Amino acid sequence: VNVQRPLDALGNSLNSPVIIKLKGDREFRGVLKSFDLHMNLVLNDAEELEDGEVTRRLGTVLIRGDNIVYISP
Amino acid sequence: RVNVQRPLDALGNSLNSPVIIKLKGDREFRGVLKSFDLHMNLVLNDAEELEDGEVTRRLGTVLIRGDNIVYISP
Amino acid sequence: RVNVQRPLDALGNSLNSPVIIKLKGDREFRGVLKSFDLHMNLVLNDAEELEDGEVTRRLGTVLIRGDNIVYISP
Amino acid sequence: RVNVQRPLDALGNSLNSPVIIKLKGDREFRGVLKSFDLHMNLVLNDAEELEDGEVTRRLGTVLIRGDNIVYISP
Amino acid sequence: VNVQRPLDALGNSLNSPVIIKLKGDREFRGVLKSFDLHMNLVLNDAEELEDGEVTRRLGTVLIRGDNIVYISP
Amino acid sequence: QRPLDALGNSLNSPVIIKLKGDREFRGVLKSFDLHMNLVLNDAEELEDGEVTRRLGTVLIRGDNIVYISP
Amino acid sequence: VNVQRPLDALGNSLNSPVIIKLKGDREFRGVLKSFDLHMNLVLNDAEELEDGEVTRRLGTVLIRGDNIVYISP
């Protein structure tokens, strides 16, 4: 990560498990497969959670960047 | 399967098949994806609308504005 | 019927036809689509505002700002 | 009354005439439309605010920011 | 007030008392001193209101245009 | 014709920043840009007019600002 | 700091501990690694707090700027 490119953190995490925190306390965990500059992204083998609890399991999911709070490899 | 710099390709890969569209505020649609643009505006055919996870109605065609979408799953 | 990369063609296909509009905050309109732009600003004629299957207001013509739209169903 | 691709021309058609403006949070204003821009910022003269079919406030001239507007009608 | 320039209503109101209604129902009243195309504006001898009663007095205040619902001279 | 000059006039002097959701900051204005992103020093955060947090320096995003009062 | 460049406050804290406050009252503490003009930023050894106590450890997190209220560098 260059001191001027935060998104290089996403690049560094391609093909690896990440945690996505959305607004409203929704959370996703899965393998990062693709992303654009808007932080739209695709995860494979995804889990949607609540209270540290799986509420849905998704083989692949496209998440719109505008609803993201943070991404944590 | 999806180019690493094109997440919207996930939409293209699923054209004319059933998808799940989670919208803000616990609304969701399930129906056949017919079209989409780079804003994630999209058209479904033969879609059920759900609210709180209960079906409220079925719509023959529906255009969803992308700014309301949270995620999409095939 | 709709080009796969042009979802707004669903609106083009429905000029002079009845449509349903669902707004953020859940307000709903039914009326005849007369005009629209790429922002989804639109004009309806013979418009009805609904709330429980009940028409709460009729307007002969109305201009709806696209930014507040959830979806549009022709 | 409006080009099928120019919904905002509905505003031009209402210039110098009474209109009804519905805002977010259910506020309603009625007055004479004096000017407007592509953002739907607009000026009314002799404006009144309505709640439950009644004037809760007489505003005279008022400039309404477009971003808060739900719909406009004659 | 020219038909394609709503901002002229502000120009007409310079140095005159105005009422500014904000998102969230907060209201401000004061003398309009300055504004820009974004509707950022400066009032002098401002008062903040909650149900027609002054809740707060300010001598000078710059209000961000993005939070404004209406301005009424 | 330029309200942003009100900020210029107040550099290096105490200001009050009111944010959305009722949060409020007081501190010395050090820097700002056209977006109203701004830096304060000796910043105090207030609630009910009470000071609940002290920050030697804070960068506040403009999009959250309701008003600024010198 | 340049009176016309508030983000120079971020530059000044590259590789230093910072405090990030988000909308809806989330707060993070960590080492600032990079940031862009939108205030998207990356923290290392990040922690999530609540009422002054740590409630969550992350080893690297990318935070979207649109959700930031303030940063205390």
**DSSP conformation letters of chain B:** ---TT-TTHHHHHTTTSEEEEEESTTEEEEEEEEEE-TT--EEEEEEEEEETTEEEEEEEEEEE-GGGEEEEE-
d(CA A61, CA A43): 5
Give the nearest partner residue to B43 out of C10, C67, C70, using CB atoms.
C10
d(CA G32, CA G10): 8
Residue with the two structure tokens 């079209």: B35
Whether residue G13 contacts residue A2, with contact meaning beta carbons closer than 8 Å, is answered with: no
Q: A53, exposed or middle or buried, with CB in 10 Å at 0-12, 13-18, 19+? A: exposed
Other CB atoms within a 10 A radius of the CB of residue F14 amount to 13
d(CA B58, CA C33): 21
Residue with the two structure tokens 């995003």: F61
Spell out a b/e string for G2-31, using b for 16 or more CB atoms within 10 Å of the CB, else e. Answer: ebeebbebbeebeeeebbbbbbeebbbbbb
Yes or no, beta carbons of G58 and A39 under 8 Å apart = no
Whether chains A and G touch (3+ CB pairs under 8 A) is answered by yes
Q: Is the domain B1-74 a CATH 2.30.30.100 member? A: yes
Of F61, F63, F45, nearest in space to F53 by CA: F45
Chain centroid offset of residue B37 CA:
12
Q: What is the phi/psi pair of residue E65, to 5°?
A: -60, -35
Yes or no, beta carbons of B72 and A61 under 8 Å apart = yes
Yes or no, beta carbons of G46 and A72 under 8 Å apart = yes
Yes or no, beta carbons of C62 and D73 under 8 Å apart = yes
d(CA B38, CA A62): 13
Most E-contacting residue of D8, D17, D62, D72 (CB-CB within 10 A), to test interface: D62
A61 bridge partner residues: A43
Whether residue F38 contacts residue F31, with contact meaning beta carbons closer than 8 Å, is answered with: yes
DSSP, collapsed to helix, strand or coil, labels residue C61 as strand
Most G-contacting residue of F5, F20, F59 (CB-CB within 10 A), to test interface: F59
At residue A19's C-alpha, the angle toward residues F19 and A7, to 5°, is 70
Q: What is the phi/psi pair of residue F21, to 5°?
A: 75, 15
Q: H-helix or E-strand containing F9?
A: helix F4-9
d(CA E21, CA A72): 40
Q: H-helix or E-strand containing D34?
A: strand D28-36
**Considering only CB atoms, which chain E residues are within 8 Å of F65?**
64
**Considering only CB atoms, which chain B residues are within 8 Å of A35?**
4-5, 7
d(CA G36, CA G32): 12
Q: H-helix or E-strand containing F7?
A: helix F4-9
DSSP calls for G5-69: -TTHHHHTTTTSEEEEEETTTEEEEEEEEEE-TT--EEEEEEEEEETTEEEEEEEEEEE-GGGEE
Resolution (angstroms) equals: 1.7
Give the nearest partner residue to C6 out of B37, B64, B65, using CB atoms.
B37
d(CA G45, CA G29): 8
Cα of C19 to nearest chain D Cα, Å? 15
Q: H-helix or E-strand containing D10?
A: helix D9-14
Q: What is the phi/psi pair of residue A64, to 5°?
A: -75, 125
**Considering only CB atoms, which chain A residues are within 8 Å of G66?**
66
- The region that residue E65 occupies, defined by phi over 0 for left and psi between -120 and 50 for alpha, beta otherwise, is alpha
**Considering only CB atoms, which chain E residues are within 8 Å of F7?**
62
Whether residue F14 contacts residue F28, with contact meaning beta carbons closer than 8 Å, is answered with: yes
Yes or no, beta carbons of C64 and D70 under 8 Å apart = yes
Fold of domain G1-73: SH3 type barrels. (2.30.30)
DSSP, collapsed to helix, strand or coil, labels residue F63 as helix
Spell out a b/e string for D5-21, using b for 16 or more CB atoms within 10 Å of the CB, else e. Answer: eebbebbeebeeeebbb
Can you read off the two tokens belonging to residue A52?
């540290």
Residue with the two structure tokens 């050894």: G45
Whether residue B30 contacts residue B46, with contact meaning beta carbons closer than 8 Å, is answered with: no
End-to-end CA distance of chain B: 13
Yes or no, beta carbons of E3 and D34 under 8 Å apart = yes
DSSP, collapsed to helix, strand or coil, labels residue D21 as strand
Give the nearest partner residue to F3 out of E24, E36, E66, using CB atoms.
E36
Class of domain F1-70: mainly beta
